Amino acid sequence: AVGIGAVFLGFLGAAGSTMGAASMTLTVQARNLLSGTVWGIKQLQARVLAVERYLRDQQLLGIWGCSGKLICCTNVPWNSSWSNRNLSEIWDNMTWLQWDKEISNYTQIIYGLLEESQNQQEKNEQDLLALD
């Protein structure tokens, strides 16, 4: 038998699993994002829009200093205001859908903090490079 693990390795197969376990199948969704007269026009528009969305996401990741990485550790400390929940709870009980629902309110704040942290790190790198 193939086994039920291949299901876990399928597209969105870990959507119901704990986010800690779902963190091991990021590449599946990441690759699915680029999978590949009026009807042709509509199909082409959809493809172009998908490409634009992927490029915007990649540009954001690069702007945070996370270019080329699927998991990127940052310098921004976690605020208890966003979520006072424990680490074990988050990474062994909840799923990414539930977590997204919980933290959807603070997402823009976190994005701005990441941008500011990357800018500060870039200028600190440039200033230490003003010193060496």
Partner 1 sequence: DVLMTQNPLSLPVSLGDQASISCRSSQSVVYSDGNAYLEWYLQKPGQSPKLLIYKASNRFSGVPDRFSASGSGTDFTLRISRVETEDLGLYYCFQGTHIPYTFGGGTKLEMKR
Partner 2 sequence: KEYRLINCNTSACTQACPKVSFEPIPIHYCAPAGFAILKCKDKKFNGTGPCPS
Partner 3 sequence: IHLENVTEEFNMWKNNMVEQMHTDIISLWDQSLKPCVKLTPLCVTLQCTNVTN
Binding string to partner 2 for residues 41 to 70, with x set by CB under 8 A, is what? -----xx--x--xx----------------
CA atoms of 90 and 16, how far apart (whole Å): 14
Say whether residue 44 binds partner 3 (CB under 8 A). no
| CA distance linking residue 30 with residue 115, whole number of Å | 22
Binding residues among 2-61 for a second copy as defined by CB under 8 A: 24, 27, 30-31, 34, 36-38, 40-41, 44-45, 47-49, 51-52, 54-56, 59
Residue that has been written with the tokens 């309110």 in this structure: 105
| b/e per residue 68-100 (b: at least 16 CB within 10 A) | eeeeeeeeeeeeeeeeeeeeeebeeebbbeebe
Query: What distance in Å separates the CA atoms of residue 91 and residue 94, rounded to the nearest whole number?
Result: 7
Beta carbon nearer to ligand NAG, 79 or 119:
79
- Convert residues 6-25 into a mask of x (bound to partner 2 by CB under 8 A) and - (unbound): -----xx-------------
Sites of contact with partner 2 (CB under 8 A): 11-12, 32-36, 46-47, 50, 53-54
